[PDB]
Amino acid sequence: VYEDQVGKFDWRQQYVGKVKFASLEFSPGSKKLVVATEKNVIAALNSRTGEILWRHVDKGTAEGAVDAMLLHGQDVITVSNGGRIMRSWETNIGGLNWEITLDSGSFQALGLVGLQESVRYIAVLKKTTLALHHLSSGHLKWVEHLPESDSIHYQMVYSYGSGVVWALGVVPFSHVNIVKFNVEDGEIVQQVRVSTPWLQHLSGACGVVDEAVLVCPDPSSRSLQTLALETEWELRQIPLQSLDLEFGSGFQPRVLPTQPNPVDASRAQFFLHLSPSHYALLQYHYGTLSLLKNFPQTALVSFATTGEKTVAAVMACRNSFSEKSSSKDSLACFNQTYTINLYLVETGRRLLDTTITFSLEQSGTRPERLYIQVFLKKDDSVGYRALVQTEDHLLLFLQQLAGKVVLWSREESLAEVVCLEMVDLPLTGAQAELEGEFGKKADGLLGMFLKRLSSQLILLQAWTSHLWKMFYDARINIDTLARDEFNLQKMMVMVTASGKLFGIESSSGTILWKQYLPNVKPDSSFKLMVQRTTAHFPHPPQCTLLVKDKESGMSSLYVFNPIFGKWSQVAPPVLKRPILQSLLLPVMDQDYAKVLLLIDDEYKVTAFPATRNVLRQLHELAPSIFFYLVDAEQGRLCGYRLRKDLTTELSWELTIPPEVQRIVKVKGKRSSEHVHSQGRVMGDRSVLYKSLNPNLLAVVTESTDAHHERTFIGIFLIDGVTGRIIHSSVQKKAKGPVHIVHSENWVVYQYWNTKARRNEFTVLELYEGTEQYNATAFSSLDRPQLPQVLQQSYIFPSSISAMEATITERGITSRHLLIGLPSGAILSLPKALLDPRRPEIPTEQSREENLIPYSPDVQIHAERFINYNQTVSRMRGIYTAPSGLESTCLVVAYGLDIYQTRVYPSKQFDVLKDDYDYVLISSVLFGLVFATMITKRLAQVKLLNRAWR
Amino acid sequence: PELLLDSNIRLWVVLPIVIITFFVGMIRHYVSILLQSDKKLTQEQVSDSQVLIRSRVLRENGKYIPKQSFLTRKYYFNNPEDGFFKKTKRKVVPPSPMTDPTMLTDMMKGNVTNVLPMILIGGWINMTFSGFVTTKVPFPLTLRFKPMLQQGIELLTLDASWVSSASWYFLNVFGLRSIYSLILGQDNAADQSRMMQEQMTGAAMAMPADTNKAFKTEWEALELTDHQWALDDVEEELMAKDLHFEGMFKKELQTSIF
Numbered sequence A: 001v002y003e004d005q006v007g008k009f010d011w012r013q014q015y016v017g018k019v020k021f022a023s024l025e026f027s028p029g030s031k032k033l034v035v036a037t038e039k040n041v042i043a044a045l046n047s048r049t050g051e052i053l054w055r056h057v058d059k060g061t062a063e064g065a066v067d068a069m070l071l072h073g074q075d076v077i078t079v080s081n082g083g084r085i086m087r088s089w090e091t092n093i094g095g096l097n098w099e100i101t102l103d104s105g106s107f108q109a110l111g112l113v114g115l116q117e118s119v120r121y122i123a124v125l126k127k128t129t130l131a132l133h134h135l136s137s138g139h140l141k142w143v144e145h146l147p148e149s150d151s152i153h154y155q156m157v158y159s160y161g162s163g164v165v166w167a168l169g170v171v172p173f174s175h176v177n178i179v180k181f182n183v184e185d186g187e188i189v190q191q192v193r194v195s196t197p198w199l200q201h202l203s204g205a206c207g208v209v210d211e212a213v214l215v216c217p218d219p220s221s222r223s224l225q226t227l228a229l230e231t232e233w234e235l236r237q238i239p240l241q242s243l244d245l246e247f248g249s250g251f252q253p254r255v256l257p258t259q260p261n262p263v264d265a266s267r268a269q270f271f272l273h274l275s276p277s278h279y280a281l282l283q284y285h286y287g288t289l290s291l292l293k294n295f296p297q298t299a300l301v302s303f304a305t306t307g308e309k310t311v312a313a314v315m316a317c318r319n320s321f322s323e324k325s326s327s328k329d330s331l332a333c334f335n336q337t338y339t340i341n342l343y344l345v346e347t348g349r350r351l352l353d354t355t356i357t358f359s360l361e362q363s364g365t366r367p368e369r370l371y372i373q374v375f376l377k378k379d380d381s382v383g384y385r386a387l388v389q390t391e392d393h394l395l396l397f398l399q400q401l402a403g404k405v406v407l408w409s410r411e412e413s414l415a416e417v418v419c420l421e422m423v424d425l426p427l428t429g430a431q432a433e434l435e436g437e438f439g440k441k442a443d444g445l446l447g448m449f450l451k452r453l454s455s456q457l458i459l460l461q462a463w464t465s466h467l468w469k470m471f472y473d474a475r476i477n478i479d480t481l482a483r484d485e486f487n488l489q490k491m492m493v494m495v496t497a498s499g500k501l502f503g504i505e506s507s508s509g510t511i512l513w514k515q516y517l518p519n520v521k522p523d524s525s526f527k528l529m530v531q532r533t534t535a536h537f538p539h540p541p542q543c544t545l546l547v548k549d550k551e552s553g554m555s556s557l558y559v560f561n562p563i564f565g566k567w568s569q570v571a572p573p574v575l576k577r578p579i580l581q582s583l584l585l586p587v588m589d590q591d592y593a594k595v596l597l598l599i600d601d602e603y604k605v606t607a608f609p610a611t612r613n614v615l616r617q618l619h620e621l622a623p624s625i626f627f628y629l630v631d632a633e634q635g636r637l638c639g640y641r642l643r644k645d646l647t648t649e650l651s652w653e654l655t656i657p658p659e660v661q662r663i664v665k666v667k668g669k670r671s672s673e674h675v676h677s678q679g680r681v682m683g684d685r686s687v688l689y690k691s692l693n694p695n696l697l698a699v700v701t702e703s704t705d706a707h708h709e710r711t712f713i714g715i716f717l718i719d720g721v722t723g724r725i726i727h728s729s730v731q732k733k734a735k736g737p738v739h740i741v742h743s744e745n746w747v748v749y750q751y752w753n754t755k756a757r758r759n760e761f762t763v764l765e766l767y768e769g770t771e772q773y774n775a776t777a778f779s780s781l782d783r784p785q786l787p788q789v790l791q792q793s794y795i796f797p798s799s800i801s802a803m804e805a806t807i808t809e810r811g812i813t814s815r816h817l818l819i820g821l822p823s824g825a826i827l828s829l830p831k832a833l834l835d836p837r838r839p840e841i842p843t844e845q846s847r848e849e850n851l852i853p854y855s856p857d858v859q860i861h862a863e864r865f866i867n868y869n870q871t872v873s874r875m876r877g878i879y880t881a882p883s884g885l886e887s888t889c890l891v892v893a894y895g896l897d898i899y900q901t902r903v904y905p906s907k908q909f910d911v912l913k914d915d916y917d918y919v920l921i922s923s924v925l926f927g928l929v930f931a932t933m934i935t936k937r938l939a940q941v942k943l944l945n946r947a948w949r
Numbered sequence B: 001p002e003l004l005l006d007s008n009i010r011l012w013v014v015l016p017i018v019i020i021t022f023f024v025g026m027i028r029h030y031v032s033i034l035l036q037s038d039k040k041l042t043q044e045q046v047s048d049s050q051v052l053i054r055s056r057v058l059r060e061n062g063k064y065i066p067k068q069s070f071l072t073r074k075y076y077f078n079n080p081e082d083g084f085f086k087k088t089k090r091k092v093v094p095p096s097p098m099t100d101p102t103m104l105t106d107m108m109k110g111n112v113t114n115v116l117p118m119i120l121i122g123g124w125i126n127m128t129f130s131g132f133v134t135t136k137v138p139f140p141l142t143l144r145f146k147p148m149l150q151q152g153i154e155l156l157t158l159d160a161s162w163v164s165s166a167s168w169y170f171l172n173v174f175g176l177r178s179i180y181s182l183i184l185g186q187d188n189a190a191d192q193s194r195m196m197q198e199q200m201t202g203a204a205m206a207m208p209a210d211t212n213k214a215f216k217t218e219w220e221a222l223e224l225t226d227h228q229w230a231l232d233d234v235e236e237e238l239m240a241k242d243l244h245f246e247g248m249f250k251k252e253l254q255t256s257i258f
């Protein structure tokens, strides 16, 4: 069936990380565009269309990061990790050309060295070790040590086409040593010693210009040092009088040199960074300096070469411009508009054809990085493509001259997703009309009759209009966003760690709205929750978002709309210390909304929707709400509770030794979960009652000490109501990543054994006896009993990156467990297979009722593969949302890409069967009538003939 | 109320099944009428039947008859010298029913095996729709009927109230059992359950399986019966009143002559 419906109601969107090292070479340039991002993934985009041709993902915990990336005519070279493994890739195809291992050093810089004709070797300089490898094949022959390496920092390695390799060594505050070697064999020629007390950094700063000219700025005395590595003896200090001498007080000055690798020689032009934004192109001939084109604003600049001519692109904030403290605004209609202009490098000419103008929509984002791809065409036309990078995470491409400046934009901030939720659609016009027409407060019989008559008349008019439309025929999604009989299209909100809110649809998958936060630093805690639903009219939907930091300790709450995007005019303030925890109260008040309260570090309850009836209901509840807090470093499990109005009191306390055990993860019970059957059939006919706990938390603790044999891992089951451990399970030979999922009454946690290289699967289930309790009111104050705990063991030959369970509204269908694999395919397996009631020896009644003999051998069937073709490179998490029919769950797997589908728990029992031929049914239906009418006359004539004869 | 269903499964299953069973019953009735064939009746058997009717009528209505003529009839029937039933003897067929075997056969034959053809129809209908949910029955049911009721849905938590198309049509068969006679009449032969079972008034009521034995049985039955002249009691009308002849004589004026 899956082959027939390839892409009917599923979609996958592939993304990549933030662009770090992107090049815009390939003079032929059919569609190739290489990008190496900061998440250990190297991708290739298309200039024309924009799709991904070939991408590769190695790592992403802490190793395999890209450090440097060089580019030859057809072959690309890059170094991963920190100087251990280096592999070279291709652009015409996708794969590995060659690989090379390095020694144990600290990667600082690499470059290309050409013997006499072209590049034959690459030079890699580490903290102390210096090496040189081949570019075509992989061979290490040139490797040697430097004179002084301990108190010496080597950076900014420059190479010449003559055949001499130069190396610059600048210590933080002392002297400077420039060394040089040959290219044929390792031979130290001579060493230059120069004293410079104001030379502090050299990694990114000083550049090489002209032909071995070292130029360095100095804001202390506001001067320039120029020295010759090739010839001369010492440096020559140059004062800054011919141009405007304006160096920022608290700013280190930067140089922007450029030297084409294919060309043995270099250029004599370079940009100087001044203050926040002050660039100036100047040329150094021998001792005289010519400055021209004193750029006033020049927010960003870029260099480019195509042939013997050099181009410099300048990005300015122009469109009525009004410059603020650091940002730039344009007061005409759209605001935040920028222009790109081309300039000559040899002279200071400005092209009259190159004039790019584009504006952004969101406010706050500013350009960060930009590349330029000039190419010669025709005879007297210069064409170039600019790729401006948005401040947070976004890519954009511009054309030279067309109808629209923006060609393709890819959202690169949709990779790292922290929290995600799904909300429904408001209503349908006819449905809303019917709901409003039914609404009656107090009326008599005559009134209801009149209303019914009016509704009937409206229905008749609608039917007449419909029939007219049929007779005639016989002869923006944001605006509509209507619902249907089975709600399958839902609006999902995604939150990025960067701080961007994305609203995408479930059916199509197009970006509807996207909002930006003022400022979000890395590793921030996010939490989204929906208070007001969309089923009602009287007030717009309300969605709240909590965000807190780690370093400073700031907590903020936002109240926005998940349907449109505009935020409401209601927001409480936050004071004291950052918000610790939040809880959603099921009781509703005010109009149709839920009440939210938060706990401060001063142990106080703050209510979000301040309302007299809200506080009255909260006070009437009083000793009914409990709060448990969990600590990892402190290792202290606390329980507080509300008393009378608003105050904490310690009720139950637990402590765990941090040195022995360590807290890792804590899962609980979902709020939206309903259990249909409260008992289970047993061998003969007897009922068995279960043990359902709405208030029960599970703690997973591991061992701090890691050894081959000594490994401690266990699960604690504690009630949040009263401190009382139900069951404490412990293993002895398990370690590594452990995943725990909690369900109706069964816990599923997986581990890895060191004694035997395998992954063991433990299923825990809680069961009561044959007699039931009160069974009308459940409370944890009472119920002084201990439920039976059942454990079983299985084998799963995989890693299980993610695990989730399909959750349905009523809970009548089966309970499938979705498991992700490192490959990317997601497999769904039934819970019945992993049942604790698996008899070892085949028993008569056991095999008679419903049971399969126990066998610890779980194989991965290829038929039970939801992901047939579309795969997820990194499965961070999977979210399952219950649909509305009965047996339909929407599964969305997030991570490096996005993919959405529908999972069928047990085939289908709510929708009409697909293979249902109506021709046969209609033919039979008509033939029955035809045969009845045929036989009627036969019977009549038979009766008449029998009577007469 | 749960398990929200589509509006396309009710218009493509319920109505088709209802019309299917309705027209199947009607077609069966019409074909049963068409296939009915007359049985040949021989003159001697006809005469035997008429003599039997005459003797039975004598047995029933014998009070309002003269005693002399009644004894003449009874002698003509009995007549120890010649005897009509005694002399007139036709061919005899060897029998086979026996006391205990037939006493048991009265129940053994019955109508036990007349449900299978309807089961065939239900099986075909269920084969057409494998995984389907037609309707729910308000009547609470026990979980031991779920295998017979659902028969194609893999659900153990679901209640047995939700029925499949098989039981839906099965209940549809007997729902119109008393409705078929409403349009046809008292003598209806549209019963879908009893397909092979012949249900009719019955051609040739008289069935003289053994003419001689029936003759002897009627001969002894007519000897047993007595005579009680119900005419001898005429005094009851003697002392009475005559007011009904005044009765419609009033209402016989009102009609004129056409």
Ligand SMILES: *[C@@H]1O[C@H](CO)[C@@H](O[C@@H]2O[C@H](CO)[C@@H](O[C@@H]3O[C@H](CO)[C@@H](O)[C@H](O)[C@@H]3O)[C@H](O)[C@H]2NC(C)=O)[C@H](O)[C@H]1NC(C)=O
Pocket: A774, A776, A777
């Ligand atoms: C099972 O749990 C339920 C709920 O806890 C118990 O029903 C509740 O029982 C209490 C105590 O008998 C009732 O409180 C009553 O309050 C009135 C005043 O409102 C007072 O006059 C009585 O003396 C009594 O204290 C409460 O109304 C009742 N709730 C309901 C909904 O009936 C039930 O007794 C428990 N059953 C067992 C076997 O433990």
Ligand SMILES: *[C@@H]1O[C@H](CO)[C@@H](O[C@@H]2O[C@H](CO)[C@@H](O[C@@H]3O[C@H](CO)[C@@H](O)[C@H](O)[C@@H]3O)[C@H](O)[C@H]2NC(C)=O)[C@H](O)[C@H]1NC(C)=O
Pocket: A006, A869
């Ligand atoms: C996994 O995805 C690949 C694509 O990357 C599938 O190969 C392509 O599959 C599509 C249909 O899924 C083929 O399209 C077909 O084209 C013919 C005309 O050429 C048309 O008559 C068909 O109706 C259909 O549209 C496409 O040709 C095919 N491409 C190749 C190179 O084979 C692949 O089948 C997928 N794997 C599966 C389905 O197991």
